[PDB]
């Protein structure tokens, strides 16, 4: 099987706005997770061809990753902060769907998710 194309990251037909919460999601939340020791597997779409995982995209139909999330933020793809938070959650739960619970990559995603939730609790008002 081929890989699917990556998720859309820009849509000129979607309205665009800057908000304090979206800026925080980019400049603090995403940046902190990006620099975490376990970030590398989550920095781009899963290359199931390279990883020899022919069933990945048979099981995962809503792929999401931090490279896509960051591009979405940079392209003003999200109107509401909750849309971005949803994509982070999708990334984590995809890992928990595809992989067996004791697997190293699941433990790594759990560590990233714990830090994510801490940073989301510091989201500013507005
Ligand atoms: C830019 O090149 C990429 C970097 C991440 C590489 N990678 C790796 C590399 C190569 C394969 C073996 C290995 O140990 N990897 C690795 C290497 C260094 C790390 F710091 C690390 F956390 C993992 N493992 C990946 C696992 C996943 C994954 C996700 C997310 N959900 O389910 C699975 C399976 C995704 C990517 C993985 C694949 C090539």
Author numbering: 42 to 167
Would you copy out the relevant sentences from the publication that reported this structure?
EP300 and CBP broadly regulate the activity of other proteins through their protein acetyltransferase catalytic activity. Using crystallography, we identify the binding mechanism of the EP300/CBP-specific BRD inhibitor CCS1477 in complex with the EP300, CBP and BRD4 BRDs, and define components of the CCS1477 catalytic binding core that are required for compound activity.
A major difference, however, between the inhibitor binding pattern in EP300/CBP and BRD4 is the involvement of an arginine side chain (EP300R1137, CBPR1173) that interacts with the difluorophenyl ring of CCS1477 through Pi-cation interactions, while establishing an additional hydrogen-bond with the piperidinone oxygen. BRD4 is devoid of an arginine in this region of the Kac site, which explains the reduced binding affinity for CCS1477. Additionally, the BRD4 binding pocket contains a WPF shelf that imposes steric hindrance on CCS1477 such that the side chain of BRD4W81 undergoes a conformational change to accommodate the difluorophenyl moiety. In EP300/CBP, an analogous tryptophan residue is not present, and instead the equivalent LPF shelf is less bulky and facilitates interaction with CCS1477. Superposition of CCS1477 as bound in the respective Kac sites reveals an altered binding pose, reflecting the reduced shape complementarity between CCS1477 and BRD4, as compared with EP300/CBP. Further analysis of the binding energies by isothermal titration calorimetry (ITC) confirmed significantly stronger interaction of CCS1477 with the bromodomains of CBP and EP300 (Kd = 4.0 and 26 nM, respectively) than with BD1 of BRD4 (Kd = 403 nM).
